[PDB]
């Protein structure tokens, strides 16, 4: 169906332990496909998915240069941020960036993204119109003025509407065997007595891809949101994800509870119950 490509940058200063480390990871949906680490023995963009390995030698040289240039650019950005925030050179700071595009089934651009953060807080972001910016504070407004003066939004827009969607389109074709295959969750409900008055019903979702999924418990047909323990979706390590939702129910009332699962790999939402 819909797909996304996203690149994530992390630049971290470490005074007294060398120059700031720069890392870049690229994803198509929930699949990591390329990585770059400035701390590597011979830093370069490296393939992390089978379908990207066929890209030509020029691809890898261009991609690697982009990252090496970025290593220097972001070290500069870190020095600039210190000035913008009147901070000393003794602390460790982090700049993060995430940018990319989302495309619909027809492969046409749905939305473009470009956002930056400093020490975990929003710094600046390209608005959805791909022509204006939103600065979080007076320091970011300084960068905004610079980027507006240099027509940066216009250059990003060109990229987001062209190369971004064009490359994503190619990757989806080359990796269609996996990128375009949704693996439905394998589901089951477990029963764990807590006391003599209440028991724990845990609804499991295993081996699914992509990560997006919805697990909910209902009591007599009513959602138990405020009464459901839901763990964060986690990676299994084989490309798939796992997740569970649990509710504490009075002994003898387990049949009044039903688990509901929604995943794009399911032609229809599923309803589960404790099967004693």
């Amino acid at each position: 169906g819909s797909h996304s490509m996203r690149y994530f940058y992390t630049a971290m200063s470490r005074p007294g332990r060398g120059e700031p480390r720069f890392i870049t990871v690229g994803y198509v949906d929930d699949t990591l496909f390329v990585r770059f680490d400035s701390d590597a023995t011979s830093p370069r963009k490296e393939p992390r998915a089978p379908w990207i390995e066929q890209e030509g030698p020029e691809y890898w040289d261009r991609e690697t240069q982009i990252s090496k240039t970025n290593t220097q650019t972001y070290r500069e950005n870190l020095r600039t941020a210190l000035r913008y925030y009147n901070q000393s050179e003794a602390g460790s700071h982090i700049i993060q960036r995430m940018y990319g595009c989302d495309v619909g089934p027809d492969g046409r651009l749905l939305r473009g993204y470009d956002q930056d953060a400093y020490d975990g807080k929003d710094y600046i972001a390209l608005n959805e119109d791909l022509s204006s910016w939103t600065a979080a504070d007076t320091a970011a407004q300084i960068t905004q003025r610079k980027w507006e003066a240099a027509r940066v939004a216009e250059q990003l827009r060109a990229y987001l509407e062209g190369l971004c969607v064009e490359s994503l389109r190619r990757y989806l074709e080359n990796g269609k065997e996996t990128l375009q295959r949704a693996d439905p969750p394998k589901t089951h409900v477990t029963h764990h007595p807590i006391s003599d008055h209440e028991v724990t019903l845990r609804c499991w979702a295993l081996g699914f891809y992509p990560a997006e999924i919805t697990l909910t418990w209902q009591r007599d047909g009513e959602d138990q949101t405020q009464d459901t323990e839901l763990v964060e979706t986690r990676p299994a390590g084989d490309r798939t994800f796992q997740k569970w939702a649990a509710v504490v129910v009075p002994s003898g009332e387990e049949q009044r509870y039903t688990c509901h699962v929604q995943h794009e790999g399911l032609p229809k939402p599923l309803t589960l119950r404790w099967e004693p």
Partner: peptide, 9 residues
């Protein structure tokens, strides 16, 4: 493929 242009803060 990444955007090949960099712009400083």
């Amino acid at each position: 493929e990444e955007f090949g242009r960099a712009f400083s803060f």
